[PDB]
Amino acid sequence: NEVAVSYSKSLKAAEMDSLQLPVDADGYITIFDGKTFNGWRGYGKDRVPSKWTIEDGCIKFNGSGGGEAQDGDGGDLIFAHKFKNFELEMEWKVSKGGNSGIFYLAQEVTSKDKDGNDVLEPIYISAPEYQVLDNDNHPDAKLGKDNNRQSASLYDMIPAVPQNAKPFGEWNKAKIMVYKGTVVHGQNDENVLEYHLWTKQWTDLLQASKFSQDKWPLAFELLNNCGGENHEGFIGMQDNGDDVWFRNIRVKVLD
Amino acid sequence: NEVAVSYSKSLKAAEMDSLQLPVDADGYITIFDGKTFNGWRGYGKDRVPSKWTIEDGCIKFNGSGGGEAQDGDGGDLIFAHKFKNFELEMEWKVSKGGNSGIFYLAQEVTSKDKDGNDVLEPIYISAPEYQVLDNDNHPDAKLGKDNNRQSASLYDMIPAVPQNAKPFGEWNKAKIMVYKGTVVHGQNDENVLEYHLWTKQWTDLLQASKFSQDKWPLAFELLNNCGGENHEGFIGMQDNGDDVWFRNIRVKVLDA
Numbered sequence: 001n002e003v004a005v006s007y008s009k010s011l012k013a014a015e016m017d018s019l020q021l022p023v024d025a026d027g028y029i030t031i032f033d034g035k036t037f038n039g040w041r042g043y044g045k046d047r048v049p050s051k052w053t054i055e056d057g058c059i060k061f062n063g064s065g066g067g068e069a070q071d072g073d074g075g076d077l078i079f080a081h082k083f084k085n086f087e088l089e090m091e092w093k094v095s096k097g098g099n100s101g102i103f104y105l106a107q108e109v110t111s112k113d114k115d116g117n118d119v120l121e122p123i124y125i126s127a128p129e130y131q132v133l134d135n136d137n138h139p140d141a142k143l144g145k146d147n148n149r150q151s152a153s154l155y156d157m158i159p160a161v162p163q164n165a166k167p168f169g170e171w172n173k174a175k176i177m178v179y180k181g182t183v184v185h186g187q188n189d190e191n192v193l194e195y196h197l198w199t200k201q202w203t204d205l206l207q208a209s210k211f212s213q214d215k216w217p218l219a220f221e222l223l224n225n226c227g228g229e230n231h232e233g234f235i236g237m238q239d240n241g242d243d244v245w246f247r248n249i250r251v252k253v254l255d
Numbered sequence: 256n257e258v259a260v261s262y263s264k265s266l267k268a269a270e271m272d273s274l275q276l277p278v279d280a281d282g283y284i285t286i287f288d289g290k291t292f293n294g295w296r297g298y299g300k301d302r303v304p305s306k307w308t309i310e311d312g313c314i315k316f317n318g319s320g321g322g323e324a325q326d327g328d329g330g331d332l333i334f335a336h337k338f339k340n341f342e343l344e345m346e347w348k349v350s351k352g353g354n355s356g357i358f359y360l361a362q363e364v365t366s367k368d369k370d371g372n373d374v375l376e377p378i379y380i381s382a383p384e385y386q387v388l389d390n391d392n393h394p395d396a397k398l399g400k401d402n403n404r405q406s407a408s409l410y411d412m413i414p415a416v417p418q419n420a421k422p423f424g425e426w427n428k429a430k431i432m433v434y435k436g437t438v439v440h441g442q443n444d445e446n447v448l449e450y451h452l453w454t455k456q457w458t459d460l461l462q463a464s465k466f467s468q469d470k471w472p473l474a475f476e477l478l479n480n481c482g483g484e485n486h487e488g489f490i491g492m493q494d495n496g497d498d499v500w501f502r503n504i505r506v507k508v509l510d511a
């Protein structure tokens with residue numbers, strides 16, 4: 001009925017605590033219980049930012065409209081257990097003109113500034129992103145190439161095809177599967193793209209993107225070796241300043 | 256057919272008057288009617304400087320050639336309605352060797368001198384600038400870093416790529432989109448750069464620029480929190496002493 005799932009409590013800490021979480025007959029672990037943030041914390045934080053709330057059985061981000069600013073008590077949210085080979089399913093709903101995302105294989109990364117201080121780097125420069133977007137009203141829908149910034153795309157790299165998103169304010173289903181380097185995104189019960197990590201094709205995707213070695217050398221370095229040395233990392237969701245809702249979040253460990 | 260657009264009349268005043276302006280089927284409001292300066296005024300002023308005129312359906316700046324001096328009855332021009340999330344489209348045409356600019360998210364800013372008098376501060380220490388330039392003949396085109404002072408650049412910060420300007424005296428199309436901190440510049444129907452306000456990437460871009468916290472503390476403070484507390488401000492155009500023409504000026508409000 002239940003499986004022990006380890007989790008970390010703060011930046012780059014070991015997963016030295018465990019949660020007893022439900023697991024169904026097909027292996028899917030329910031990692032959001034609809035009532036608490038147990039095992040969840042802000043990216044780089046030891047607490048859940050207060051702009052993330054629980055309402056009607058959902059994780060809700062309460063956005064103020066500043067895009068990547070992450071102002072107020074905000075920041076991206078992670079379920080603090082590193083996964084390697086897994087299949088994530090969840091429902092998501094985005095507000096009109098809204099933008100969020102589902103990250104996977106994320107690392108908590110810091111750099112050093114010129115004086116030796118730590119600088120926490122964005123989750124999205126280590127973590128591939130399954131885009132979450134109002135495809136009809138958010139201007140990013142029209143940016144990038146071939147609609148590779150629309151919902152369920154691998155952000156700025158591979159478009160969702162078919163682009164079968166339901167309209168804003170409606171519930172969509174996401175699937176993200178990572179299995180021995182093979183990645184599939186699903187949207188509303190259809191596979192909408194597939195790729196292979198750590199290949200020549202993967203490098204080419206990066207080199208064509210905002211994360212290219214020439215445009216963002218640190219991002220290229222992290223994403224080109226996605227998941228770090230052990231090829232694992234966190235699932236999470238994006239504070240891009242807009243109201244968004246997530247529910248029925250479940251993960252099956254595949255090996 | 257038309258929408259009410261509020262505008263302010265003098266320095267830092269509330270927008271307590273409104274104009275009925277045409278809106279098209281896609282939501283773009285025509286803010287320059289080809290005939291009057293309704294809703295427009297000099298930055299810091301309650302009037303249009305007389306070096307700004309209307310000529311053949313265009314807003315024209317009549318330059319005397321003094322560069323940054325703003326001599327005579329000049330000074331930058333603003334459309335006095337603060338926009339937050341918006342997409343601006345206009346056409347611009349620059350005289351040979353000319354320099355101007357399209358400002359956005361501008362604030363009217365004053366500081367105090369040592370005796371407590373007001374000093375009107377330049378529009379560009381609060382307002383990002385879409386550079387307007389004759390890239391073939393203005394020496395600014397060779398200055399800065401990686402052509403980040405050529406037309407449609409975020410002046411002294413992000414170069415326009417591709418640099419697809421038309422030659423001097425030809426019409427160019429400008430786009431400036433600000434949507435929840437995402438900013439895009441367009442030139443001649445291509446997107447030529449993208450950046451994100453209020454991020455550490457934005458801070459880093461300022462700290463490498465002429466508006467760095469070391470070189471210009473007030474500019475840094477204003478630009479680092481671009482648009483002030485409500486993240487909004489004026490669209491406007493630059494008196495850099497050179498003849499320039501603007502036309503077909505339309506803004507679409509992108510959010511509620």
Ligand SMILES: OC[C@H]1O[C@H](O)[C@H](O)[C@@H](O)[C@@H]1O
Pocket residue numbers: 050051052053062
């Ligand atoms: O602490 C503030 C947060 O929690 C409150 O309950 C509000 O529902 C939410 O809008 C806000 O982001």
Ligand SMILES: O=C1C(O)=CO[C@H](CO)[C@H]1O
Pocket residue numbers: 068099100101124129131140155238240437
């Ligand atoms: O949606 C996005 C966008 O609009 C801004 O950049 C973010 C990270 O690449 C992405 O999540």
Ligand SMILES: O=C1C(O)=CO[C@H](CO)[C@H]1O
Pocket residue numbers: 323354355356379384386395410493495
């Ligand atoms: O074009 C410009 C230049 O030549 C001088 O500085 C101005 C303000 O930054 C800019 O608009």
Ligand SMILES: [Ca+2]
Pocket residue numbers: 099100101129131132238240
């Ligand atoms: Ca996103």
Ligand SMILES: [Ca+2]
Pocket residue numbers: 354355356384386387493495
């Ligand atoms: Ca200029």
